[PDB]
Coordinates of C-alpha atoms and ligand atoms in Angstrom, one line a residue:
Chain A
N1 CA 17.6 37.2 -7.9
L2 CA 14.6 36.0 -5.9
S3 CA 12.2 38.9 -5.8
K4 CA 12.4 38.7 -9.5
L5 CA 11.3 35.0 -9.4
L6 CA 8.4 35.5 -6.9
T7 CA 7.1 38.3 -9.2
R8 CA 6.3 36.0 -12.2
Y9 CA 5.5 32.9 -10.0
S10 CA 3.6 34.1 -6.9
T11 CA 2.3 30.6 -6.4
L12 CA 6.0 29.9 -5.4
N13 CA 6.0 32.6 -2.9
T14 CA 2.9 31.0 -1.2
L15 CA 4.7 27.6 -1.2
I16 CA 7.6 29.0 0.6
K17 CA 5.5 30.7 3.2
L18 CA 3.7 27.3 3.8
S19 CA 7.0 25.5 4.1
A20 CA 8.2 27.7 6.8
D21 CA 5.1 27.2 8.9
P22 CA 4.7 24.0 11.0
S23 CA 1.0 24.6 11.3
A24 CA 0.6 24.4 7.4
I25 CA 3.1 21.4 7.2
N26 CA 1.1 19.6 9.8
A27 CA -2.1 20.3 8.0
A28 CA -0.5 18.8 4.8
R29 CA 0.5 15.8 6.8
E30 CA -3.0 15.2 8.1
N31 CA -4.3 15.4 4.5
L32 CA -1.8 12.7 3.5
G33 CA -3.2 10.4 6.2
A34 CA -6.8 10.9 5.0
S35 CA -6.0 10.5 1.4
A36 CA -4.0 7.3 2.2
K37 CA -7.1 5.9 4.0
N38 CA -9.1 6.8 0.9
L39 CA -6.7 5.0 -1.3
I40 CA -5.8 1.8 0.6
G41 CA -8.6 1.5 3.2
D42 CA -11.7 2.0 1.0
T43 CA -13.3 0.2 -1.8
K44 CA -16.0 2.0 -3.8
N45 CA -14.3 5.4 -3.5
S46 CA -10.7 4.2 -4.1
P47 CA -9.4 4.8 -7.5
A48 CA -6.7 2.3 -6.7
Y49 CA -9.1 -0.4 -5.6
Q50 CA -11.2 0.2 -8.7
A51 CA -8.1 -0.1 -11.1
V52 CA -7.0 -3.5 -9.4
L53 CA -10.6 -4.7 -9.8
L54 CA -10.4 -3.7 -13.5
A55 CA -7.2 -5.3 -14.2
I56 CA -8.5 -8.6 -12.7
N57 CA -11.8 -8.6 -14.3
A58 CA -10.4 -7.9 -17.8
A59 CA -8.2 -11.1 -17.4
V60 CA -11.1 -13.1 -16.2
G61 CA -13.4 -11.6 -18.9
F62 CA -10.9 -12.5 -21.7
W63 CA -11.2 -16.3 -20.8
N64 CA -14.9 -16.0 -20.4
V65 CA -15.1 -14.7 -24.1
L66 CA -12.7 -17.3 -25.6
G67 CA -12.5 -20.3 -23.4
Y68 CA -15.3 -22.2 -25.0
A69 CA -13.6 -21.9 -28.5
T70 CA -10.2 -23.1 -27.3
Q71 CA -9.0 -26.7 -28.2
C72 CA -7.5 -28.7 -25.4
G73 CA -6.7 -32.4 -25.0
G74 CA -4.1 -35.1 -24.7
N75 CA -2.6 -36.9 -21.7
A76 CA -0.6 -35.9 -18.8
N77 CA 2.8 -35.3 -19.9
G78 CA 1.7 -32.8 -22.6
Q79 CA 1.6 -36.0 -24.8
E80 CA -1.0 -36.6 -27.4
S81 CA -3.8 -39.1 -26.4
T82 CA -5.7 -41.8 -28.3
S83 CA -9.1 -41.4 -26.5
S84 CA -9.1 -39.0 -23.5
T85 CA -11.9 -36.8 -22.5
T86 CA -11.1 -34.5 -19.5
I87 CA -13.7 -32.3 -18.3
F88 CA -13.3 -29.2 -16.1
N89 CA -16.2 -27.9 -14.1
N90 CA -17.3 -24.4 -13.3
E91 CA -15.7 -23.3 -16.6
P92 CA -17.5 -21.2 -19.4
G93 CA -18.0 -23.7 -22.1
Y94 CA -20.4 -23.7 -25.1
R95 CA -23.9 -23.9 -23.7
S96 CA -22.3 -25.3 -20.7
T97 CA -20.9 -24.8 -17.3
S98 CA -17.9 -27.1 -18.1
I99 CA -15.1 -27.1 -20.6
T100 CA -14.3 -30.3 -22.3
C101 CA -10.8 -31.3 -23.4
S102 CA -11.3 -34.2 -25.9
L103 CA -8.9 -33.4 -28.9
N104 CA -7.0 -36.6 -29.6
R105 CA -4.0 -37.5 -31.8
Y106 CA -2.8 -34.0 -32.2
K107 CA 0.2 -33.0 -30.2
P108 CA -0.5 -30.3 -27.6
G109 CA 1.3 -27.1 -28.3
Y110 CA 1.4 -24.0 -30.2
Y111 CA -1.6 -23.5 -32.6
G112 CA -2.8 -26.8 -31.4
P113 CA -4.6 -28.1 -28.4
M114 CA -3.8 -26.8 -24.9
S115 CA -2.2 -29.5 -22.8
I116 CA -4.0 -30.6 -19.8
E117 CA -1.0 -29.3 -17.7
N118 CA -1.5 -25.9 -19.0
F119 CA -5.2 -26.1 -18.6
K120 CA -4.9 -27.2 -15.0
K121 CA -2.7 -24.3 -14.2
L122 CA -5.2 -22.0 -16.0
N123 CA -8.2 -23.5 -14.4
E124 CA -6.9 -23.1 -10.8
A125 CA -6.1 -19.5 -11.4
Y126 CA -9.6 -19.0 -12.9
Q127 CA -11.4 -20.7 -10.0
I128 CA -9.4 -18.7 -7.4
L129 CA -10.2 -15.5 -9.2
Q130 CA -13.8 -16.3 -9.6
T131 CA -14.3 -17.2 -5.9
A132 CA -12.6 -14.0 -4.8
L133 CA -14.5 -11.8 -7.1
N134 CA -17.6 -13.4 -5.8
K135 CA -16.8 -12.8 -2.2
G136 CA -15.6 -9.3 -3.0
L137 CA -12.1 -8.0 -3.1
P138 CA -10.9 -6.4 0.2
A139 CA -9.2 -3.1 0.5
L140 CA -5.6 -2.8 -0.5
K141 CA -4.4 -2.5 3.0
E142 CA -5.9 -5.9 3.8
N143 CA -3.1 -8.4 3.2
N144 CA -4.0 -11.3 5.5
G145 CA -7.4 -12.4 4.2
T146 CA -7.8 -15.8 2.7
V147 CA -10.4 -17.6 0.7
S148 CA -11.4 -21.3 0.3
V149 CA -11.8 -22.6 -3.2
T150 CA -13.1 -25.9 -4.5
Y151 CA -13.2 -27.3 -8.0
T152 CA -13.6 -30.6 -9.8
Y153 CA -12.6 -32.3 -13.1
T154 CA -13.2 -35.6 -14.6
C155 CA -11.3 -38.2 -16.8
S156 CA -12.8 -40.7 -19.1
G157 CA -11.7 -42.8 -22.0
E158 CA -9.4 -45.7 -22.5
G159 CA -5.8 -44.6 -21.6
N160 CA -6.6 -41.3 -20.0
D161 CA -4.1 -40.7 -17.3
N162 CA -4.9 -37.1 -16.3
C163 CA -6.5 -38.4 -13.1
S164 CA -3.8 -40.8 -12.2
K165 CA -1.5 -41.1 -9.1
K166 CA 1.3 -39.5 -11.0
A167 CA -0.9 -36.5 -12.3
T168 CA -2.5 -36.0 -8.9
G169 CA -0.5 -37.5 -6.0
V170 CA -3.4 -39.6 -4.7
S171 CA -2.7 -43.3 -3.9
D172 CA -6.1 -45.1 -4.5
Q173 CA -8.3 -43.9 -7.4
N174 CA -11.4 -44.8 -5.5
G175 CA -11.8 -42.9 -2.1
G176 CA -8.2 -41.7 -1.8
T177 CA -7.0 -38.4 -0.4
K178 CA -3.8 -36.4 -0.4
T179 CA -2.8 -33.2 1.4
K180 CA 0.0 -31.0 0.4
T181 CA 1.0 -27.4 1.4
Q182 CA 2.6 -24.6 -0.6
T183 CA 3.3 -20.7 -0.9
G184 CA 4.5 -15.4 2.7
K185 CA 1.6 -17.7 3.4
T186 CA 0.8 -21.5 3.9
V187 CA -1.9 -22.7 1.4
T188 CA -3.3 -26.2 2.1
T189 CA -4.6 -28.3 -0.7
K190 CA -6.6 -31.5 -0.4
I191 CA -7.1 -33.7 -3.4
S192 CA -9.6 -36.5 -3.4
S193 CA -10.4 -39.0 -6.0
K194 CA -13.6 -41.1 -6.8
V195 CA -14.6 -43.5 -9.6
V196 CA -18.1 -43.7 -11.1
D197 CA -18.7 -46.8 -13.2
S198 CA -20.6 -46.5 -16.5
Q199 CA -23.7 -48.4 -15.2
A200 CA -24.0 -46.7 -11.7
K201 CA -27.4 -45.0 -11.3
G202 CA -27.4 -41.3 -11.6
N203 CA -24.7 -41.5 -14.4
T204 CA -26.5 -39.9 -17.3
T205 CA -23.4 -39.7 -19.5
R206 CA -23.1 -43.1 -20.6
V207 CA -19.5 -43.8 -19.5
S208 CA -17.0 -44.5 -16.7
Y209 CA -15.1 -41.7 -15.1
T210 CA -12.7 -40.6 -12.4
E211 CA -13.5 -37.5 -10.5
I212 CA -10.9 -35.3 -8.8
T213 CA -11.9 -32.7 -6.2
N214 CA -9.4 -30.1 -5.1
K215 CA -10.1 -28.1 -2.0
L216 CA -7.7 -25.2 -1.2
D217 CA -7.8 -23.5 2.1
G218 CA -6.0 -20.4 3.1
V219 CA -5.7 -19.1 -0.4
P220 CA -4.5 -15.5 -0.2
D221 CA -7.1 -13.0 -1.5
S222 CA -4.7 -9.9 -1.1
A223 CA -4.6 -7.7 -4.2
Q224 CA -1.0 -8.7 -4.9
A225 CA -1.9 -12.3 -4.6
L226 CA -4.8 -12.0 -7.0
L227 CA -3.0 -10.0 -9.5
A228 CA -0.5 -12.9 -9.6
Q229 CA -3.2 -15.2 -10.3
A230 CA -4.6 -13.0 -13.1
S231 CA -1.1 -12.8 -14.6
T232 CA -0.7 -16.6 -14.4
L233 CA -4.1 -16.9 -16.3
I234 CA -3.3 -14.6 -19.1
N235 CA 0.4 -15.7 -19.5
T236 CA -0.6 -19.4 -19.5
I237 CA -2.9 -18.6 -22.5
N238 CA -0.4 -16.4 -24.2
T239 CA 2.6 -19.0 -23.9
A240 CA 0.5 -22.0 -24.6
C241 CA -1.1 -20.2 -27.6
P242 CA -3.7 -22.8 -28.5
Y243 CA -5.9 -23.1 -31.6
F244 CA -9.3 -21.7 -31.2
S245 CA -12.5 -21.6 -33.3
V246 CA -15.6 -19.7 -32.5
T247 CA -19.2 -20.3 -33.2
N248 CA -20.1 -16.9 -34.7
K249 CA -23.6 -16.3 -33.2
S250 CA -25.8 -15.5 -36.2
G251 CA -27.4 -12.4 -35.0
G252 CA -25.4 -9.5 -33.3
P253 CA -21.6 -9.3 -32.6
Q254 CA -19.0 -10.8 -35.0
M255 CA -15.7 -12.2 -33.9
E256 CA -12.5 -11.2 -35.9
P257 CA -11.0 -13.6 -36.8
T258 CA -12.9 -16.8 -36.5
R259 CA -10.3 -19.6 -36.5
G260 CA -6.7 -19.1 -35.3
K261 CA -4.4 -19.2 -32.4
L262 CA -5.1 -17.5 -29.1
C263 CA -2.1 -15.3 -28.9
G264 CA -3.2 -13.7 -32.3
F265 CA -5.2 -11.3 -30.2
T266 CA -2.0 -9.3 -29.6
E267 CA -3.5 -6.0 -28.8
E268 CA -5.9 -7.6 -26.3
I269 CA -3.4 -9.6 -24.5
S270 CA -0.7 -6.9 -24.4
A271 CA -3.3 -4.5 -23.0
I272 CA -4.3 -6.9 -20.3
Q273 CA -0.8 -7.7 -19.4
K274 CA 0.0 -4.0 -19.2
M275 CA -2.9 -3.5 -16.9
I276 CA -1.9 -6.1 -14.6
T277 CA 1.8 -4.8 -14.7
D278 CA 0.4 -1.4 -13.8
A279 CA -1.8 -2.6 -11.0
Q280 CA 1.1 -4.5 -9.5
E281 CA 3.2 -1.5 -9.6
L282 CA 0.3 0.4 -8.0
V283 CA -0.2 -2.0 -5.2
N284 CA 3.5 -1.8 -4.4
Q285 CA 3.2 1.7 -3.4
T286 CA 1.1 0.6 -0.5
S287 CA 4.2 -0.4 1.5
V288 CA 5.9 2.9 0.8
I289 CA 2.8 4.6 2.3
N290 CA 2.9 2.5 5.4
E291 CA 6.6 2.7 6.0
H292 CA 6.3 6.5 6.0
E293 CA 3.4 7.3 8.2
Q294 CA 2.7 11.0 8.5
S295 CA 0.9 11.1 11.7
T296 CA 3.5 12.6 14.2
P297 CA 3.3 16.4 14.5
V298 CA 6.5 18.4 13.5
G299 CA 7.6 21.7 14.8
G300 CA 10.9 23.1 15.9
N301 CA 12.6 22.0 19.0
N302 CA 13.2 23.5 22.5
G303 CA 10.4 26.2 22.1
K304 CA 12.5 27.6 19.3
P305 CA 11.2 28.8 15.9
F306 CA 11.0 26.2 13.2
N307 CA 14.0 26.3 10.9
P308 CA 13.3 24.8 7.5
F309 CA 17.1 24.3 6.9
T310 CA 17.7 22.1 9.9
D311 CA 14.5 20.7 11.5
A312 CA 13.1 19.1 8.5
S313 CA 14.5 15.5 8.6
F314 CA 10.9 14.2 8.3
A315 CA 10.6 15.7 4.8
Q316 CA 12.2 12.9 3.0
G317 CA 9.5 10.5 4.2
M318 CA 6.6 12.9 3.6
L319 CA 7.9 13.3 0.0
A320 CA 8.2 9.6 -0.5
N321 CA 4.7 9.1 0.8
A322 CA 3.1 11.9 -1.2
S323 CA 4.9 10.7 -4.3
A324 CA 3.8 7.1 -3.8
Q325 CA 0.1 8.3 -3.5
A326 CA 0.3 10.4 -6.8
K327 CA 1.9 7.4 -8.3
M328 CA -1.1 5.2 -7.3
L329 CA -3.4 7.7 -8.7
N330 CA -1.7 8.0 -12.0
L331 CA -1.3 4.3 -12.4
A332 CA -4.9 3.7 -11.6
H333 CA -5.7 6.2 -14.2
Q334 CA -3.3 4.5 -16.8
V335 CA -5.1 1.2 -16.1
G336 CA -8.5 2.6 -17.0
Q337 CA -7.1 4.2 -20.2
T338 CA -5.6 0.9 -21.5
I339 CA -9.0 -0.7 -21.8
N340 CA -11.4 2.1 -22.0
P341 CA -13.3 1.9 -25.4
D342 CA -13.5 5.6 -25.9
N343 CA -9.8 5.6 -26.9
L344 CA -9.6 2.3 -28.8
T345 CA -9.5 1.6 -32.4
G346 CA -10.7 -1.2 -34.9
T347 CA -10.4 -4.8 -34.0
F348 CA -9.5 -4.1 -30.5
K349 CA -12.4 -1.7 -29.9
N350 CA -14.9 -4.3 -31.4
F351 CA -13.5 -6.9 -29.1
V352 CA -14.1 -4.8 -25.9
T353 CA -17.4 -3.2 -26.8
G354 CA -19.0 -6.4 -28.5
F355 CA -17.5 -9.0 -26.2
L356 CA -15.4 -8.1 -23.2
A357 CA -17.7 -5.4 -21.8
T358 CA -20.8 -7.6 -22.2
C359 CA -22.6 -10.2 -20.2
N360 CA -25.0 -12.8 -21.5
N361 CA -25.8 -14.3 -18.2
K362 CA -29.5 -13.9 -17.2
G363 CA -26.9 -8.3 -12.7
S364 CA -25.9 -12.0 -11.8
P365 CA -23.3 -11.7 -9.0
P366 CA -19.6 -11.5 -9.8
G367 CA -17.9 -14.8 -10.4
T368 CA -20.8 -16.8 -11.7
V369 CA -20.5 -19.1 -14.5
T370 CA -23.6 -20.1 -16.3
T371 CA -24.4 -22.0 -19.5
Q372 CA -24.6 -18.6 -21.3
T373 CA -21.3 -17.1 -20.0
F374 CA -19.4 -18.0 -23.1
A375 CA -18.5 -15.4 -25.6
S376 CA -19.0 -12.6 -23.2
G377 CA -16.8 -11.1 -20.5
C378 CA -19.2 -11.4 -17.6
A379 CA -16.9 -9.5 -15.4
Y380 CA -18.4 -6.1 -14.8
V381 CA -15.9 -4.5 -17.1
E382 CA -18.2 -1.6 -18.1
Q383 CA -19.4 -0.9 -14.6
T384 CA -15.9 -0.9 -13.3
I385 CA -14.6 1.6 -15.8
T386 CA -17.5 3.8 -14.8
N387 CA -16.8 3.4 -11.1
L388 CA -13.1 4.1 -11.6
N389 CA -14.0 7.4 -13.3
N390 CA -16.6 8.2 -10.6
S391 CA -13.9 7.6 -8.0
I392 CA -11.2 9.7 -9.7
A393 CA -13.8 12.5 -10.0
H394 CA -14.4 12.3 -6.3
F395 CA -10.7 12.5 -5.6
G396 CA -10.3 16.0 -6.9
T397 CA -9.5 17.7 -3.7
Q398 CA -7.3 14.9 -2.5
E399 CA -5.2 14.9 -5.5
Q400 CA -4.5 18.6 -5.1
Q401 CA -3.7 18.0 -1.5
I402 CA -1.2 15.3 -2.4
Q403 CA 0.5 17.6 -4.9
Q404 CA 0.8 20.3 -2.3
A405 CA 2.1 18.0 0.3
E406 CA 4.7 16.9 -2.2
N407 CA 5.7 20.4 -3.1
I408 CA 6.1 21.3 0.5
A409 CA 8.2 18.3 1.3
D410 CA 10.3 18.9 -1.9
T411 CA 11.0 22.4 -0.9
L412 CA 12.2 21.2 2.6
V413 CA 14.4 18.6 1.1
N414 CA 15.9 21.2 -1.1
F415 CA 16.5 23.5 1.8
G416 CA 18.0 20.7 4.0
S417 CA 20.4 19.6 1.3
Chain B
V1 CA -0.8 19.2 -25.4
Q2 CA -3.4 21.9 -25.0
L3 CA -5.6 23.4 -22.5
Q4 CA -7.0 26.9 -23.3
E5 CA -9.4 28.6 -21.0
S6 CA -11.5 31.8 -21.8
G7 CA -14.5 33.7 -20.7
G8 CA -13.1 35.4 -17.5
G9 CA -13.5 39.1 -16.8
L10 CA -14.5 41.6 -14.1
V11 CA -18.1 41.2 -12.8
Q12 CA -20.3 42.5 -10.1
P13 CA -21.4 40.5 -7.1
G14 CA -24.6 38.6 -7.9
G15 CA -23.3 38.2 -11.5
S16 CA -22.7 35.4 -13.9
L17 CA -20.0 34.3 -16.2
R18 CA -19.5 31.3 -18.5
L19 CA -16.0 29.9 -18.8
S20 CA -14.8 27.8 -21.6
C21 CA -11.9 25.3 -22.1
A22 CA -10.9 24.0 -25.4
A23 CA -8.9 20.8 -24.7
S24 CA -7.0 18.5 -27.1
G25 CA -8.5 15.0 -27.9
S26 CA -5.6 13.4 -26.0
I27 CA -6.4 15.1 -22.8
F28 CA -10.2 15.2 -23.0
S29 CA -11.4 11.9 -24.6
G30 CA -12.6 9.3 -22.1
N31 CA -11.2 11.3 -19.2
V32 CA -12.6 12.9 -16.2
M33 CA -12.3 16.6 -16.6
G34 CA -12.4 19.5 -14.2
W35 CA -12.0 23.1 -13.1
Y36 CA -9.6 24.6 -10.6
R37 CA -8.9 27.9 -9.4
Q38 CA -6.1 29.8 -7.7
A39 CA -6.8 32.8 -5.6
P40 CA -4.4 35.5 -4.3
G41 CA -2.2 34.1 -1.6
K42 CA -3.4 30.6 -2.0
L43 CA -2.5 27.5 -3.9
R44 CA -4.6 26.0 -6.6
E45 CA -7.9 24.6 -5.3
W46 CA -10.1 21.9 -7.0
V47 CA -13.6 23.3 -7.9
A48 CA -15.6 20.9 -9.9
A49 CA -15.4 17.7 -12.1
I50 CA -17.4 15.8 -14.7
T51 CA -17.1 12.2 -15.8
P52 CA -17.2 11.2 -19.6
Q53 CA -20.8 10.2 -19.1
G54 CA -21.5 13.7 -17.7
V55 CA -21.8 13.1 -13.9
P56 CA -20.7 16.3 -12.3
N57 CA -19.5 17.0 -8.7
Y58 CA -18.5 20.1 -6.8
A59 CA -16.4 21.5 -4.0
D60 CA -18.6 22.7 -1.2
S61 CA -17.7 26.4 -1.7
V62 CA -19.3 26.4 -5.1
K63 CA -22.0 23.8 -4.9
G64 CA -25.5 25.0 -5.8
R65 CA -24.1 28.0 -7.7
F66 CA -21.7 26.6 -10.4
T67 CA -22.5 24.1 -13.1
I68 CA -19.9 22.1 -15.1
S69 CA -20.6 20.5 -18.4
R70 CA -18.9 18.9 -21.3
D71 CA -19.4 18.7 -24.9
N72 CA -18.0 15.4 -26.2
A73 CA -18.3 16.0 -29.9
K74 CA -16.2 19.2 -29.6
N75 CA -13.8 18.6 -26.7
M76 CA -15.1 21.5 -24.8
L77 CA -15.6 22.0 -21.0
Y78 CA -17.7 24.7 -19.5
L79 CA -18.4 26.3 -16.2
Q80 CA -21.4 28.3 -15.7
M81 CA -20.9 30.5 -12.6
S82 CA -23.8 32.2 -10.8
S83 CA -24.3 34.3 -7.7
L84 CA -20.7 35.3 -7.8
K85 CA -19.0 36.6 -4.7
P86 CA -15.8 38.4 -4.1
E87 CA -14.4 35.2 -2.7
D88 CA -14.7 33.7 -6.2
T89 CA -12.0 36.0 -7.5
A90 CA -9.2 33.8 -8.9
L91 CA -7.4 32.5 -12.0
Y92 CA -9.5 29.6 -13.2
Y93 CA -7.9 26.6 -15.0
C94 CA -9.1 23.4 -16.5
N95 CA -7.5 20.0 -16.8
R96 CA -8.2 16.4 -16.7
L97 CA -8.2 14.3 -13.6
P98 CA -5.6 13.2 -12.6
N99 CA -3.9 16.2 -14.0
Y100 CA -1.8 16.6 -17.0
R101 CA 1.5 18.1 -15.8
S102 CA 1.4 21.3 -17.9
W103 CA -1.3 23.8 -17.2
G104 CA -2.9 26.3 -19.5
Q105 CA -2.6 29.9 -19.0
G106 CA -6.0 30.3 -17.2
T107 CA -8.6 32.9 -17.3
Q108 CA -9.0 35.6 -14.8
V109 CA -12.2 36.1 -12.9
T110 CA -12.6 39.2 -10.7
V111 CA -15.6 39.9 -8.7
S112 CA -16.0 43.4 -7.3
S113 CA -18.6 46.1 -6.6
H114 CA -18.7 49.5 -8.4
Ligands
LIG501 C1 -5.5 -47.7 -10.5 C2 -4.7 -47.4 -11.8 O1 -3.6 -47.8 -11.9 N1 -5.4 -46.6 -12.7 C3 -4.6 -46.3 -13.9 C4 -5.2 -47.2 -15.0 O2 -6.7 -47.1 -15.0 C5 -7.5 -48.0 -15.6 C6 -7.2 -49.4 -15.0 O3 -7.4 -49.4 -13.6 C7 -8.1 -50.3 -15.6 C8 -7.9 -51.8 -15.1 O4 -8.5 -52.7 -15.9 O5 -9.5 -50.0 -15.4 C9 -9.9 -48.7 -15.9 O6 -11.1 -48.4 -15.2 C10 -12.1 -49.3 -15.5 C11 -12.9 -49.6 -14.3 O7 -12.1 -49.9 -13.2 C12 -14.2 -50.5 -14.5 C13 -15.1 -50.5 -13.4 O8 -15.8 -49.3 -13.1 O9 -14.8 -49.9 -15.6 C14 -14.3 -49.7 -16.8 O10 -15.2 -49.1 -17.5 C15 -16.1 -49.8 -18.4 C16 -17.2 -50.5 -17.7 O11 -18.0 -49.6 -17.0 C17 -18.0 -51.4 -18.6 C18 -19.0 -52.3 -18.0 O12 -18.3 -53.6 -17.8 O13 -18.7 -50.6 -19.5 C19 -17.7 -49.8 -20.3 O14 -18.4 -48.9 -21.2 C20 -19.3 -49.6 -22.1 C21 -20.8 -49.6 -21.6 O15 -20.8 -50.3 -20.4 C22 -21.6 -50.2 -22.7 O16 -23.0 -49.8 -22.2 C23 -21.4 -49.6 -24.1 O17 -21.6 -48.2 -24.1 O18 -20.0 -49.9 -24.4 C24 -19.1 -49.2 -23.5 C25 -17.7 -49.3 -24.0 O19 -17.7 -50.4 -24.9 C26 -16.8 -49.1 -19.4 O20 -15.8 -48.5 -20.3 C27 -13.0 -48.8 -16.6 N2 -12.3 -48.6 -17.9 C28 -12.2 -47.4 -18.6 C29 -11.5 -47.3 -19.8 O21 -13.0 -46.5 -18.2 C30 -8.9 -47.6 -15.5 O22 -9.2 -46.5 -16.3 C31 -9.2 -45.2 -15.7 O23 -10.2 -45.1 -14.7 C32 -11.5 -45.1 -15.4 C33 -12.6 -45.1 -14.3 C34 -11.6 -43.9 -16.3 O24 -11.3 -42.6 -15.5 C35 -10.5 -44.0 -17.3 O25 -10.5 -42.7 -18.1 C36 -9.2 -44.1 -16.6 O26 -8.2 -44.1 -17.5 O27 -4.7 -46.9 -16.3 C37 -4.8 -45.5 -16.7 C38 -3.9 -45.4 -18.0 O28 -4.6 -46.4 -18.9 C39 -4.3 -44.5 -15.6 O29 -2.9 -44.5 -15.6 C40 -4.9 -44.9 -14.3 O30 -4.3 -44.0 -13.3

């Protein structure tokens, strides 16, 4: 019996009254449009935006902490080298804005040096992420923005083939250029090569080298695209699993352990992978939201009272939209809880509080590599956790409105079925 | 698992009440927390919230009269209510934001003249 229900659950009686009233249904649909703008059209006040940003900064931060400690070297085919130094610019090396790959004789691989092939793949993702963070990420609904990215590396030493025609695609080592394209979007890449002799003036390093410049135009800076870059960054590290050893700075924070393999940070890498996975799922709700616009008013037909049993074909879409928004909100929350130091324990808590949520740069803007970036995240991790919480706090009303819109629609789908 | 509000009662307009919520560590620790209320004939309405670092914010209907606070050592959430009006009559509830799917029992606040 139903009077008996609506006695103990009077909240349910109100819900049914609201579901029979086009004017309350339309109000709930307006609210869904406004909370959608907040989630996918805004930046500072979008929980969704803040969690995407957090997932990306945690990946970048992880490399800013450990990159300088990581062995790399060898030649182009993942082969060991006899005497190859390959240096990657705008990377957070030890007291330096470059990372030097100069480990010879050892075969590249697991618990050894990172091959130059993996490092190139890693470095490209890093430079793209850093350029995008620096310019500022766009709102989740902006899917056709692009950024330009430029980066350089150098090869020296007898036998070093990491800047060759085969590694690069460029015909003449001195002055040559090659253009290739790639992928929904066309990304154009221009690669250029130059040779600097050992004696040339303005060559302080005492040796001959080849320089490769890569210029990428039309790089997508959408959230989905950047998360894919962050995933590439962290997965390359985890799969290559190179040896590292840290300079334990004889003063404050202490790295645990000091020698080892990079994938030995299992809790940290898992957490970051899980953040990225959750932010990807979160950003996928965007198209669910766009596909089920809630802006048309609903309300009977033929000047005849609204009938919740027959006239509610729109309910399916309203439910899917409301559910997609709630899911965004919850995933955004899950992202923050994966990395928030308040709920973390031991080794993993030290890593985040002592290194990842720290910056040693003399705030400097996002995406800036200095000679003191190494061993600190320098990716605004603490500020982002804080802004995620601030934005969740300012989403109180909207979350209730979304749950109400979902309940209304769910009632109409039940009645229609 | 656990949200448990207390402190409600019948008061006079102009009056004060202090509500409490004892929350489990799971729910409370490192989470935004807040207060909600459900008045006769209406659905649940958000009322106030506070970040882990203690930044409060309020719905317009209670701003300047209610104060939300948190005690991080004891997993406690509080809502000090002043200048109460009949319109504040409701079941008050606390939860994290975003909400844990199971609500506590709430604590009744009634504001009414004698
Ligand atoms: C086009 C091609 O196929 N390239 C592949 C090739 O690359 C090497 C070859 O082209 C050989 C051909 O002989 O040359 C290497 O490059 C040469 C330069 O062309 C040449 C002129 O700039 O300089 C060589 O460097 C020398 C030179 O500067 C001398 C002065 O005469 O000094 C040497 O350093 C001295 C220093 O001057 C002294 O003060 C003191 O300190 O002693 C030191 C050393 O004793 C300086 O080494 C240069 N050779 C080298 C080894 O650098 C090509 O090498 C590549 O390009 C150079 C510029 C670097 O990037 C290397 O790392 C590259 O490997 O073969 C490769 C495989 O071996 C690749 O497949 C290339 O694609």
